[PDB]
Amino acid sequence: MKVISFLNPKGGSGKTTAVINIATALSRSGYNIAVVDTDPQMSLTNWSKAGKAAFDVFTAASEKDVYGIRKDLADYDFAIVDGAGSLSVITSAAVMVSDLVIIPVTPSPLDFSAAGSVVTVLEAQAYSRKVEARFLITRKIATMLNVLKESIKDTGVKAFRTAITQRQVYVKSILDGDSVFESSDGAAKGEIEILTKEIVRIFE
């Protein structure tokens, strides 16, 4: 059983969109996936209500639910935590039980600051058990793209090779209650797929 958490208190980092699609790609690979929504706005929970999720969706009522994910979702291959906002406990709880922390970040310069709060938590965790961490560029298109790439290197945490390109298909699919794999967008499905293999490769 492995836990993957998408953390970044900043809203609009692209956590839910990534989670929904990467979780779906993992299912397509034959893995049993459990996703836990920790956001109060329940973006993912509501999306799943459409009934098209290719995995199991859970809605956390508090940090307590995150705290007991290892035991609760122990029968799944992967348990993905869809990060919250202001509730900083969620981040600490997630990091504490995660095997892979992914930090979705956009090229927005004035938004990288929030992603750093997660790194601070990671560094602290390192004392107990260093958890693999990766930055993930989302809503990719630039110069600020390069500046972001340098700020990331300063954190000591590497970024995934594949970035989530900004595409309407990501917005529409979630809106229709499904993922990019329910569309005919090969490029979109492709990067999500390649990205999903970089995740799997990290575990292998």
Ligand SMILES: Nc1ncnc2c1ncn2[C@@H]1O[C@H](COP(=O)(O)OP(=O)(O)O)[C@@H](O)[C@H]1O
């Ligand atoms: N890869 C993407 N391509 C196009 N728009 C995106 C992408 N990722 C996120 N967005 C847009 O930005 C918003 C924030 O994404 P979301 O996954 O909800 O973020 P968090 O998970 O940051 O709340 C979406 O509602 C959508 O409008």
Ligand SMILES: [Mg+2]
């Ligand atoms: Mg979200």
